[PDB]
Ligand binder design. Structure first.
Ligand SMILES: *[C@@H]1O[C@H](CO)[C@@H](O)[C@H](O)[C@H]1NC(C)=O
Lengths: 441, 49
């Protein structure tokens, strides 16, 4: 039997309801969200890492001029320094005093550590939203099955079909361009491929971790060898990857609104408390029981014992429940001003049962629907003493939950005072007009 | 669970209270003063005999 509703996107707060079917006793439904994953569709653009300036062995020609030949290599530099008299352990490397040439070449590669640490540049557009859901209904225990939040995909949770309806808000913590480094995610407007400056980020960009293009812009200049020494000096801008690592401000794991937790197989934003989720469950007909086989509850009288609008279940009430037959039967408080802790109560022929509830109102005035009949509960509630707690609120405020009787009466006396004064003035104006009209006429 | 109060300085008269904690049954509290000593800091000036 279908049951449509709308529930908040909060994780851990169970949505409770009473599925009422004409002719059958209600069944208590409890749908809770274990987690909700916004899983975007990524497209890798490139990979950034530290560079390695490969410096091959210089070519020393003794009495010749050998010349550069451009090779297809990232940031390849070849220079032909002339007038080199190399000295080495044997001593006198080349004969000709001045007509000696050294060809030094250098080119940038991926560092060996690029396969372990690297930044993946990603373009994110939009993705599936998935969530794990816990449902209970009647005597059926928890089922805890994973669903797709699109509003069209049934999910067979036990023997119930849940069509979890799309998120009201299309908000996603990621912008178009992100950078993934290790377990951190950054909302970085990375340079496009082949644009990276010399030392900021993307100075070394590779499409994949095993690519061969390896665009690299490092400003590598070969320098003249020192007199005597056969070495290949060069000057280069320090890696922009490390500059990024020690200037990168704050990941999205910390910045993220709504308490999104960013995970990185596959790249997702978890437990984000934004908007509402339509739901449509189809409880099987075997769960329902005929209304004739269920207790009928009369003479309901509810008294609120000590209550306080704490985030936890800070309210206790007792209901006297003189009944017809004995057995288990559900309770639910539809108003949304109080959240009932317990799902069922076991009833004897007569007596009383106690239930806990959570609320934000100073005066919680809520209807508790037991079994079939309903009872109205009202009372007074005290402030919680604890300032900061480690658990989220189990209820919702409603912008009237704090007004309280005294402030209600005060604002009433104020509004009524102003209204009465103005209406007294207007009736006075009418009375003068009428008396003057009677004066002449 | 904290409970603040003010009690008389009488010795032997028990101060009684009901410590009430929201959500929990009240607890009876009985604080009694066996004795109260005002102990000044003395410094010997001299001795006479
Ligand atoms: C909800 O399902 C989870 C598994 O996702 C399970 O561990 C838990 O027991 C269920 N809820 C309750 C109240 O048992």
């Amino acid at each position: 039997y279908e049951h449509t509703a709308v529930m908040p996107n909060k994780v851990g707060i169970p949505y409770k309801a009473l599925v009422e079917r004409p002719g059958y006793a209600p069944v208590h439904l409890q749908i809770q969200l274990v987690n909700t994953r916004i899983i975007p569709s990524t497209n890798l653009e490139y990979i950034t890492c530290k560079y390695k300036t490969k410096v091959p062995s210089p070519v020393v020609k003794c009495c010749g001029a050998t010349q550069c030949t451009s090779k297809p290599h990232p940031d390849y530099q070849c220079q032909v320094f002339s007038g080199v008299y190399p000295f080495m352990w044997g001593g006198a490397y080349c004969f000709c005093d001045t007509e000696n040439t050294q060809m030094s070449e250098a080119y940038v590669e991926r560092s060996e550590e690029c396969s372990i640490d690297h930044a993946k540049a990603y373009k994110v557009h939009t993705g599936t939203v998935q969530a794990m859901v816990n449902i209970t209904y009647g005597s059926v225990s928890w089922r805890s099955a994973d669903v797709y939040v699109n509003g069209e995909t049934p999910a067979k949770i036990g023997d119930a079909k849940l069509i979890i309806g799309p998120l009201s808000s299309a908000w996603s913590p990621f912008d178009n361009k992100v950078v993934v480094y290790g377990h951190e995610v950054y909302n970085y407007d990375f340079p496009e491929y082949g644009t990276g400056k010399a030392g900021s980020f993307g100075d070394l960009q590779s499409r994949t971790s095993t690519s061969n293009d390896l665009y690299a812009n490092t400003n590598l200049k070969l320098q003249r060898p020192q007199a005597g020494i056969v070495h290949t000096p060069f000057t280069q801008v320090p890696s922009g990857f490390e500059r990024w690592k020690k200037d990168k401000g704050a990941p999205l794991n910390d910045v993220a609104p709504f308490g999104c937790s960013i995970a990185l197989e596959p790249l997702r934003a978890e437990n984000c408390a934004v908007g509402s989720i339509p739901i449509s469950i189809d409880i099987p007909d075997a769960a329902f029981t005929r209304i004739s086989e269920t207790p009928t509850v009369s003479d309901l009288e509810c008294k609120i014992t000590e209550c306080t609008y704490a985030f936890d279940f800070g309210g206790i009430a007792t209901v006297a429940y003189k009944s017809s037959k004995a057995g288990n039967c559900p309770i639910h408080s539809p108003s949304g001003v109080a959240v009932i802790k317990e799902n069922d109560v076991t009833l004897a022929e007569s007596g009383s049962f106690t239930f806990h509830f959570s609320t934000a109102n100073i005066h919680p005035a809520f209807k508790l629907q037991v079994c079939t009949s309903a009872v109205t509960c009202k009372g007074d509630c005290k402030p919680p003493k604890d300032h900061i707690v480690d658990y989220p609120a189990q209820h919702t405020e409603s912008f009237t939950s704090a007004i309280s009787a005294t402030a209600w009466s005060w604002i009433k006396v104020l509004v009524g005072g102003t209204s009465a004064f103005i209406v007294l003035g207007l009736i006075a104006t009418a009375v003068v007009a009428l008396v003057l009209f009677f004066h002449r006429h």
